[PDB]
């Protein structure tokens, strides 16, 4: 379980050059990377690079060339060439240390976030107000009632006889 | 909770879209988690069904134990069986206008139930 750490790169990575990453990862002071790497196995005899990625050694090797940010640090251990066994990700890519999984883990995290949001919305809308068997059974004025007549409705026809005799005067002054 | 649910849905959609874009860009011990999850799901289903049963069979059991004030299934059929029959213009059923033998002039009936917070209150359907 090498995913519980939530570290980031703020000052330990002052530059993203080729030789700076190796010097940063080889000298962890205090936190730069996992101290249980093959740094001691590479510096056991002398300054070389056989035990780093050439020979058979369980070391965090550069699985791919990435000069811009950082190479893909993977625990490379294989007797033959062109092979990488991925189990985690301790690099500074994406500013987080995930499990280096496929679209499965991303879709699972998205579904978890969506389910959390849906549960929150359901809890918020549940205890707001609910209907009952009886309409407003709790606690145990005239703005829609339009009284129609339609007998003397003729008055509306007479309505179009006042503005013709004298029309209103527009003001445009809401004092 | 309109704005709260809207913000929750927006956050969920943002997270889903971010995860989908990340996936697209990348493409080119006595734990017994299952048992605990099944137990929690059973507990949740039981709580939901109990809430439903409390909403249905406990708040509607008024007239089932003793006939009390309730227009639902206790008042409308009374006046129906006692005075007139069912008819649907909108909700107008059997207006009293002596149309059986009047032959003078027709009149309809605007009769409709209403609600009010009180004790022992019927529908009070509306010359006058």
């Amino acid at each position: 379980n090498l995913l519980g750490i939530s570290w980031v790169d703020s000052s330990w990575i002052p530059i993203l050059n080729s030789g700076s990453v190796l010097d940063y990862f080889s000298e962890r002071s205090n936190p730069f990377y996992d101290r249980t790497c093959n740094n001691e196995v590479v510096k056991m005899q002398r300054l070389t690079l056989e035990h780093l990625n050439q020979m058979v050694g369980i070391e965090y090797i550069l699985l791919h060339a990435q000069e811009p940010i950082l190479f893909i640090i993977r625990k490379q251990q294989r007797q033959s060439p062109a092979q990488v066994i991925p189990l985690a990700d301790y690099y500074i890519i994406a500013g987080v240390i995930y499990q280096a999984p496929d679209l499965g883990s991303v879709i699972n995290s998205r579904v978890l976030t969506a389910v959390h949001g849906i549960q929150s919305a359901f809890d918020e809308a549940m205890s707001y107000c609910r209907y009952h068997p009886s309409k407003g059974y709790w606690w145990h004025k005239r703005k829609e009632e339009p009284s129609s007549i339609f007998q003397r409705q003729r008055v509306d026809a007479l309505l179009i006889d006042l503005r013709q005799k004298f029309p209103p005067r527009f003001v445009q002054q809401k004092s | 909770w309109p704005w709260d649910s809207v913000r929750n849905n927006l956050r969920s959609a943002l997270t889903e879209m971010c995860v989908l874009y990340d996936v697209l860009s990348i493409v080119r011990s006595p734990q017994t988690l299952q048992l605990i999850s099944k137990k929690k799901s059973l507990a949740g289903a039981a709580q939901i069904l109990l809430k439903g049963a409390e909403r249905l069979t406990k708040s509607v059991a008024e007239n089932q134990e003793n006939k009390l004030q309730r227009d639902f299934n206790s008042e409308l059929l009374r006046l129906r069986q006692h005075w007139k029959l069912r008819k649907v213009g909108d909700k107008i059923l059997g207006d009293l206008s002596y149309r059986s033998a009047g032959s003078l002039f027709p009149h309809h009936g605007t009769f409709e139930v209403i609600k009010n917070t009180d004790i022992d209150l019927d529908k009070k359907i509306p010359l006058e």
């Binding site: 129609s148 445009q172 809401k174 | 213009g89």
Partner: peptide, 19 residues
């Protein structure tokens, strides 16, 4: 500036008395 039109429709007294 209340209105700049000629209005007679808003009253719209309904019938709702279909027999």
């Amino acid at each position: 500036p209340k209105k700049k039109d000629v209005e007679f429709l808003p009253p719209q007294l309904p019938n709702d008395k279909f027999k």
